[PDB]
Symmetry: C5
Subunit: 47 residues, 5 copies
Amino acid sequence: SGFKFLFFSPDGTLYGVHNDKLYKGTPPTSDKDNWLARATLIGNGGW
Amino acid sequence: SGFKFLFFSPDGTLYGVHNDKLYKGTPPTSDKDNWLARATLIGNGGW
Amino acid sequence: SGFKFLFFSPDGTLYGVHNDKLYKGTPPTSDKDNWLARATLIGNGGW
Amino acid sequence: SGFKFLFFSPDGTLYGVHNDKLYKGTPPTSDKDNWLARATLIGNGGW
Amino acid sequence: SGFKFLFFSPDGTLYGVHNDKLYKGTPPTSDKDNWLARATLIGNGGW
Ligand SMILES: CC(=O)N[C@@H]1[C@@H](O)[C@H](O)[C@@H](CO)O[C@@H]1O
Ligand SMILES: CC(=O)N[C@@H]1[C@@H](O)[C@H](O)[C@@H](CO)O[C@@H]1O
Ligand SMILES: CC(=O)N[C@@H]1[C@@H](O)[C@H](O)[C@@H](CO)O[C@@H]1O
Ligand SMILES: CC(=O)N[C@@H]1[C@@H](O)[C@H](O)[C@@H](CO)O[C@@H]1O
Ligand SMILES: CC(=O)N[C@@H]1[C@@H](O)[C@H](O)[C@@H](CO)O[C@@H]1O
């Protein structure tokens, strides 16, 4: 329901591990931005 | 209570997760600076 | 299972500590990429 | 009594949370450098 | 044993906290590199 890791790449992409899955995307623009709903799934487990 | 994550973007802005919410702001320069009060709330839950 | 540390170097390489071993590699861009099966093992224990 | 967070800004300034307080300074130069004694206190609580 | 923190400075140098002491060094490029044995001790305790 939260993140295990949450961190930036050098180009300013936000990375996060949520429910053992790896996600990336531009950081949220405002508090109504549903970041997890639009982040790119780049890893399907094991993180 | 405290922060679960506290980290920089490569652009120099400080980010923090506090009570499952996501905040960003220029880092504080003195302890007279209540950072959490002037930080931009960019995530209302789920972090 | 999963990582204990997961973080970028400033040149864009992803690093991870997994089962006390250190791994590095380009970050995944697809969840078809089994990152840990192709990451370079750079530390065999003690991490 | 140790740090809870310890991390770099993009210009190379070290940040640390110690006893719920936020500190910053140039990173320690050597083991004779008492970093915590010379670091700037930039946050007096809540970290 | 192991690391409490393990992170990069923006100049590419790897930092690690091991048994309350702070180390820095160029990151390992193979698992034959005993990183901790060659790392520079930059803090003798309190991390
Ligand atoms: C930690 C790691 O490398 N996890 C990957 C996962 O991201 C990926 O989706 C899957 C594809 O089969 O392989 C591995 O499980
Ligand atoms: C992890 C994540 O994406 N959290 C967001 C939250 O920050 C945002 O306030 C909310 C608005 O709909 O959507 C999601 O819950
Ligand atoms: C924390 C650390 O420096 N670990 C290294 C390990 O990565 C490496 O495989 C081994 C080489 O013999 O030496 C050390 O144990
Ligand atoms: C988490 C946070 O923003 N803490 C700050 C603290 O650093 C600062 O010294 C104080 C000033 O009144 O305000 C807040 O408590
Ligand atoms: C957290 C911190 O600043 N630790 C330092 C330690 O690294 C250093 O070796 C010593 C020098 O006397 O002073 C402090 O204990």
